Amino acid sequence: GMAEYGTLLQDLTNNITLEDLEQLKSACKEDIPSEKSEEITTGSAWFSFLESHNKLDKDNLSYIEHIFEISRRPDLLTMVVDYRTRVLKISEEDE
Amino acid sequence: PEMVRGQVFDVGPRYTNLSYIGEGAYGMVCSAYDNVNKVRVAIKKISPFEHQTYCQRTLREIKILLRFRHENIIGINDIIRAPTIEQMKDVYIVQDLMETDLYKLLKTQHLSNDHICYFLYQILRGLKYIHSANVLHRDLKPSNLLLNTTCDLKICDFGLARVADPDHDHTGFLTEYVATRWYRAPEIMLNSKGYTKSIDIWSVGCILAEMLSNRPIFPGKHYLDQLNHILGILGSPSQEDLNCIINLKARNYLLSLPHKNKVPWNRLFPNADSKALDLLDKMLTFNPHKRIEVEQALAHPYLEQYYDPSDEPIAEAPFKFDMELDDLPKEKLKELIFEETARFQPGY
């Protein structure tokens, strides 16, 4: 749910340096051309930019997974895969 | 103009009596009767000019295979395209017809040890030539190993090939091509550069394993799963091997994982020649710098019946690209392809 997703974006941003971020931004630029002209300085600004372009939400993780793979960040990737597992397990309560 | 499945396949009058083989991204394959050489041949129609990366792949394959001459590497016999650059939308590459490939064969039958030995030797004999040219194939896998009806093997598919250059960083050219996940060396997954000839040796180790059991050794479904399949067999990397990962974030990730013990090869491959397994161990070494290289693999006891430097040709000289193709716009690549293909024109 929304809380687990908030925690995920916090966890990720906590592990994305500004140096890291320039890499993630470059990997996105061909897919979302307005990226350059947007002045993204934080991890949380990057995630907001992805959300506003329909590339990320609590149930839509595949693009950041893609970007983490191509950026060779299995550490960030594993937080996303673990979040997906958690969300699936939570859903087993209400079935 | 000849037609197939309602598509233009304009290779006549030289090439006639077409038969559709199959289809892929941007290219269909037919066999055809070659009225000059009086044999059937394979022809792939490629239509790359709207995509920079497809133009890159097309030009790399043409340039390399036109320069290479080796029994275990597929040649290019002919190339057909339009007489003017403006009208050129497709390129038809004519090659020796090969009845099958290793992927199909492994779906069909379990191989004797003598056939596994012979196929491995031919893969490495072809790779010895490629590497002697300072070229990395980068896409070795069973479907890129063509075979005839008498076990003669030819390496194909040179679209991802590059001159070896450990020091140069990525452009996403290899990365956006992902039907080759199962044969990808760990350093490609973990580091963005520093790759050497050892990446191809890894893929050959994967192919050897696949010939032993008729199944892929590391069939991961995604990125993390792929790394888990490798580590679940090789065991956790050593400290020395963790220091091959320049990527500090990747390295921390690997260090976070639960310990895994190495699985002995003979547990996984209980019917394999023990010399074959000793070779496999050296090809599937995590550390790309310690991994066995092609001449040493050929000289291994498993291949002693075949190893024969007097009957293993190498390249006269290193292969070079005049300029890096990876940064050239698709229109410039189109011009280079027009130029590369000119020598095959009737009016040349």
UniProtKB/Swiss-Prot annotation, chain A:
Phosphorylated by protein kinase C and calcium-calmodulin-dependent protein kinase. These phosphorylation events are modulated by neurotransmitters or hormones. Keywords: Apoptosis, Cytoplasm, Phosphoprotein, Sugar transport, Transport. The keyword Nucleus does not apply. Ubiquitously expressed. Most abundant in tissues such as heart, brain, muscle and adipose tissue which utilize glucose as an energy source. Lower expression in glucose-producing tissues. Higher levels of expression are found in tissues from individuals with type 2 diabetes than in controls. GO terms for cellular component: cytosol; intracellular membrane-bounded organelle; microtubule associated complex; nucleoplasm. One of its GO terms (biological process) is negative regulation of extrinsic apoptotic signaling pathway via death domain receptors. Binds RPS6KA3, MAPK3 and MAPK1. Transient interaction with PLD1 and PLD2. Interacts with CASP8 and FADD. This is Astrocytic phosphoprotein PEA-15. It comes from Homo sapiens (Human). The lineage of its organism: Eukaryota, Metazoa, Chordata, Craniata, Vertebrata.
Swiss-Prot record, chain B:
It catalyses: L-seryl-[protein] + ATP = O-phospho-L-seryl-[protein] + ADP + H(+); L-threonyl-[protein] + ATP = O-phospho-L-threonyl-[protein] + ADP + H(+). GO terms for biological process: apoptotic process; B cell receptor signaling pathway; Bergmann glial cell differentiation; cardiac neural crest cell development involved in heart development; caveolin-mediated endocytosis; cell surface receptor signaling pathway; cellular response to amino acid starvation; cellular response to tumor necrosis factor. The modification Phosphotyrosine is found at Y177. This is Mitogen-activated protein kinase 1. Pfam families: Pkinase (PF00069). Keywords: Acetylation, Apoptosis, ATP-binding, Cell cycle, Cell junction, Cytoplasm, Cytoskeleton, Disease variant, DNA-binding, Host-virus interaction, Kinase, Membrane, Nucleotide-binding, Nucleus, Phosphoprotein, Repressor, Serine/threonine-protein kinase, Transcription, Transcription regulation, Transferase, Ubl conjugation. The keyword Membrane applies. Residues 249-267 bind DNA. It is an enzyme of class 2 (transferase). It comes from Homo sapiens. The TXY motif contains the threonine and tyrosine residues whose phosphorylation activates the MAP kinases.
